[PDB]
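FAQ
Q: What does a multi-component entry look like?
A: The components come first, one per line:
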Amino acid sequence: QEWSREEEERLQAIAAAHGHLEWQKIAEELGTSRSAFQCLQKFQQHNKALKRKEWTEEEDRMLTQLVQEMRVGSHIPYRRIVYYMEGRDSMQLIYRWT
DNA sequence: CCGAAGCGAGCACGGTGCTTTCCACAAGATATATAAAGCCAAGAAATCGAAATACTTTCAAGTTACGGTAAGCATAT
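Then the predicted structure of the entire assembly, as tokens:
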């Protein structure tokens, strides 16, 4: 069975109280009868730390270097930017050249 | 007719511990025939497994309609 949007709060609370070291004990103390890998995916999907914030200037240098080094025609491989630049997903990163 | 010289020679060398070509004619070989019985054995007909050239669905990617605050400039008091 899927979640009911009521266990992620206690999950992140226990993860912050323990230090995000061992997710197995966290899942066992949470009492969901599910594997740690099955709940960690939804935890990271509901987490906000995976995203980014207002754009700086020093990262523009790296983006321009990566473009001038591995861009082809009118297509830009933003997946390479996701691989190199941490924090940027594939959805909202394309705006960096839109 | 004896004499010299080769010359071939029996004689010794210790104790022990077979193939094929024909007359012999007396058997063999090949010949049906039931007849029950299961199996082996090659030629078709039916059946099923592997899969490739196709269809559904999943999944990555960018471009899409729709804001979230924030900053430079006009004009009233």
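Q: Is there any commentary attached?
A: Sometimes. For this entry: Residues 75-79, 90-91, 94, 98 of chain A lie near DNA strand B (CB under 10 Å from a C1').
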